[PDB]
Design a protein around this nucleic acid. Sequence first.
DNA 1: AAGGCCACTGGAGCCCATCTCCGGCA
DNA 2: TTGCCGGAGATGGGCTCCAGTGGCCT
Lengths: 124, 129
Amino acid sequence: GVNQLGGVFVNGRPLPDVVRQRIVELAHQGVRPCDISRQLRVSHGCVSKILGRYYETGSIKPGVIGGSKPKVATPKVVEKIAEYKRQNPTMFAWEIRDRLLAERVCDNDTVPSVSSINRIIRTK
Amino acid sequence: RDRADLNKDKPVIPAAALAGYTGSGPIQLWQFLLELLTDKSCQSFISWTGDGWEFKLSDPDEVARRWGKRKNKPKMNYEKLSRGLRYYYDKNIIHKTAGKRYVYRFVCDLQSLLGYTPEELHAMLDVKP
DNA sequence: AAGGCCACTGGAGCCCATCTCCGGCA
DNA sequence: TTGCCGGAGATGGGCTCCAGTGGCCT
């Protein structure tokens, strides 16, 4: 994609480190953000966020994009899984599920799937 | 500028339609203005001066009001639409005709984009000029 | 049965085009 | 004193990402 200043951009992706770098630099040299923006062909909004994060952080590294937070893999639930396995190291994945239900730790909706629960064991 | 009857009858250059064509985007102020300009039903608040791609905001407040609607921005108004146009200045899209309030002009090559001339379009809208 | 494989998600961050508040200048 | 110009943090749109999750297979 091409912005209205004439710049080349990739919708969704961070501005290249080499450029974020230049942005900070020019600002350091005393160039006004509106000029940098108009010059380096970058939306003043963007120049703004970058400069601001740098002044507030010291980095030119953009935030971490993507991922998600746990849904079923609740903190407590993750522990219960450790407790059950610790008690009986060979209890099956589906048996842990029934125990989580039997002790009301999870609903018929909260309850983590077998795959997930074995995934919890593996990764913890 | 299109083969299929990519949807009919009313405005000559529907912004919703031009977006799909000219690059892309969630409707840009200038595109909004082109649309309203190619809609006979709107000729009382905004219209072509007759001189090339230049136009006038017969009723800036009415133009503004509408813009707000399009963008779902109830707080819009001339003040902000104006600075919006003022923003287009160094992007060589819109320029203000000195010595006249409410009159502006598209300076990008609309002929290449639209596939029409000023006069061509003008005729189709029945431009008093 | 636990691990390999995995389509599918949603919410996060990203730049962009304003929106918005306001100082400058005439 | 009205009239226009322009700087820059705030917005939310469409987009790319990806941890996370839950089937399916073996």
